[PDB]
Design a protein around this ligand. Structure first.
Ligand code: PAF
Ligand code: NA
Ligand code: NA
Length: 310
């Protein structure tokens, strides 16, 4: 069974219980998220382990047979979102450590959630999986590279350390997912049945941990960070659509790259912020809020297209 049909079905069927569990957790057991703070890199690693657990060599066919459509998506990813974050930081003159967190999100690759949103938007799913996989696999070099170029003068770099952080949090769990898939063969369908549950649980723990650990600066700047997230996410959609349109790509691919650009692996941003900016928790907040908003705006954008398709 397609993992994207498993994920959307799981969310659509239990979105209420998650909203109630988070609510009761943040109010009657705030420790649930504070205790998970030091495990944000592992929680993300679990998410990426899922991507690798479901990735098959067939998902790269469109790359090897239609390289130019995939190359456009990867270029549009790293050409739009890093620069967009930098511009929003300067035009709004954000605090230094908030701008670093916003730029950090922009320099990350596309989000793994775009595959489901493209599936829900009825775009080119094969393209969505390809661009996200390519951008993710080359992010150990591009994400720290672009990140220091756009925010170098704002803080220390440790670009080499961030590369290894992405290798351990992204490449290694993906590789583990691939070999676990090879070892178990068909028995992996039962492990992927629990992937929607495990992934969502990890996603909410990461968000609540970052939020709860930075509630002082969220009170005074949280609304400003959300606004930046909405604009960053929205501008990515707009430019991702006009990028696919102006290059002459079909409508299904225009929806794919629209979702691909605007949506980010904001969990990686939060994990990198926790590992390389631990003494400045606010650096991780843009990734936490982005992780929330882009799934809201993504599903809403998919719903709009789903309605116009009739
Ligand atoms: C938080 C997350 C896992 C889903 O929104 C995001 O980092 C992504 O799409 O990869
Ligand atoms: Na994708
Ligand atoms: Na993106």
């Amino acid at each position: 069974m397609n993992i994207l049909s498993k994920i959307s079905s799981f969310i659509g069927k239990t979105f209420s219980l998650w909203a109630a569990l988070f609510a009761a957790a943040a109010f009657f057991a705030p420790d649930t998220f504070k205790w998970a703070g030091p495990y944000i890199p592992w929680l993300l690693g679990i998410i990426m382990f899922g991507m690798g657990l479901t990735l098959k060599p067939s998902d790269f066919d469109i790359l090897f047979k239609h390289p130019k459509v995939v190359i456009i998506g990867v270029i549009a990813q790293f050409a739009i979102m890093p620069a967009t974050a930098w511009l929003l930081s300067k035009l709004l003159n954000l605090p230094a450590e908030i701008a670093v967190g916003v730029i950090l999100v922009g320099c990350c690759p596309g989000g793994t959630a775009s595959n489901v949103m493209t599936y829900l938007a009825r775009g080119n799913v094969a393209l969505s999986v390809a661009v996200t996989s390519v951008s993710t696999l080359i992010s150990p070099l591009l994400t720290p590279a672009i990140f220091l170029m756009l925010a170098g003068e704002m803080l220390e770099i440790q670009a080499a350390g961030m590369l290894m952080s992405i290798v351990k949090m992204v490449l290694l769990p993906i590789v583990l997912g691939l070999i676990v898939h090879k070892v178990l063969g068909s028995k992996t369908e039962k492990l992927t049945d629990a992937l929607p549950l495990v992934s969502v649980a990890a996603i909410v723990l990461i968000i609540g941990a970052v939020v709860g650990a930075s509630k002082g600066k969220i009170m005074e700047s949280g609304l400003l960070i959300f606004a930046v997230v909405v604009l960053h996410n929205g501008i990515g959609y707009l430019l991702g659509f006009f990028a696919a349109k102006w290059t002459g790509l079909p409508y299904d691919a225009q929806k794919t790259l629209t979702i691909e650009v605007g949506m980010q692996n904001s969990g990686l941003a939060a994990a990198l912020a926790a590992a390389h900016f631990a003494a400045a928790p606010v650096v991780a907040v843009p990734g936490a809020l982005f992780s929330v908003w882009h799934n809201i705006s993504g599903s809403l954008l998919a719903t709009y297209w789903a309605a116009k398709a009739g």
